[PDB]
Design a protein around this ligand. Structure first.
Ligand SMILES: Cc1nc2scc(-c3ccc(F)cc3)c2c(=O)[nH]1
Ligand SMILES: Cc1nc2scc(-c3ccc(F)cc3)c2c(=O)[nH]1
Lengths: 146, 145
């Protein structure tokens, strides 16, 4: 077992959904993590997700980060379909009861929203990456601290 | 103007209806449900037709009105969605006020109904979305509990 600073905000979470199966929070040691508050049916999310996917494909290795979907979907089949087409990780559907309070904790007032977190400490690096990705597509100023 | 709905909607004048606009004053003496919703939200899309049935049966006899408060940002979605509904709507040009209205009543998800006395603006319930399911004949309307 390995600890994780993400457990500061996901104390009920252990595994994340991934394209390789499941990954522990501990597996993200040393990384920058983006919590991506989104939903399958939200129109502005539909416009943003491909932009974030392109950024992810380009930079996630060289800039040592992961993206974890935090979905507002309340329908499990919709959740899996939506996440299936993304390239990154997801908080499992069985954590859906925590999503509202997690949004409140980070001052999420609408979606899409990105919250940038240090995986080791749980420190919030930034809250504006949803726009910075568009402003800075090659991530010159990543991870966009204030 | 004088109605207690005006305390919540200071930038509004009129609400949309099926036959053109109506004043806030036209709701004098009514129980009013503020219906926090969005055209693309699945539980809303499932609840709207249920609420429509409830409205059609009871709105006259139990002297209430429903007012759509929509999270829609796309005007074509708004008009189409409100087109499914028999009741009133906060006009699309007031949509910038929807979030603060949600915060006024502690709306933390949708669909949500907030029940208000129109004249005084008093909140008389927050659980009507649930009560409509359990009590579709409105025996316990307006559900003080
Ligand atoms: C399209 C859309 N869907 C959703 S699902 C949840 C939200 C949302 C709204 C307000 C908040 F304070 C937090 C999330 C939200 C939103 O803002 N827009
Ligand atoms: C489907 C859906 N859409 C929307 S659009 C806005 C909301 C929402 C979310 C959180 C709040 F505090 C208020 C509204 C919301 C929601 O909760 N569910």
């Amino acid at each position: 077992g390995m600890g994780s600073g993400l457990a500061k905000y996901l104390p009920g979470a252990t595994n994340l959904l991934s394209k390789s199966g499941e990954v522990s929070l501990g597996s993200l040691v040393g990384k920058t993590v983006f919590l991506y508050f989104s939903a399958s049916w939200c129109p502005p999310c539909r416009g943003f997700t491909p932009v974030l996917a392109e950024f992810y494909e380009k930079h996630h290795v060289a800039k040592n980060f992961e993206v974890v979907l935090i979905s507002w979907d309340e329908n499990e089949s919709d959740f899996h379909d939506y996440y299936g087409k993304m390239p990154w990780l997801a908080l499992p559907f069985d954590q859906r009861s925590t999503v509202s309070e997690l949004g409140k904790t980070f001052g999420v007032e609408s979606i899409p929203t990105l919250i940038t977190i240090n995986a080791d400490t749980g420190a919030i690096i930034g809250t504006q990456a949803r726009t910075r990705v568009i402003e800075d597509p090659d991530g010159a100023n990543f991870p966009w601290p204030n």
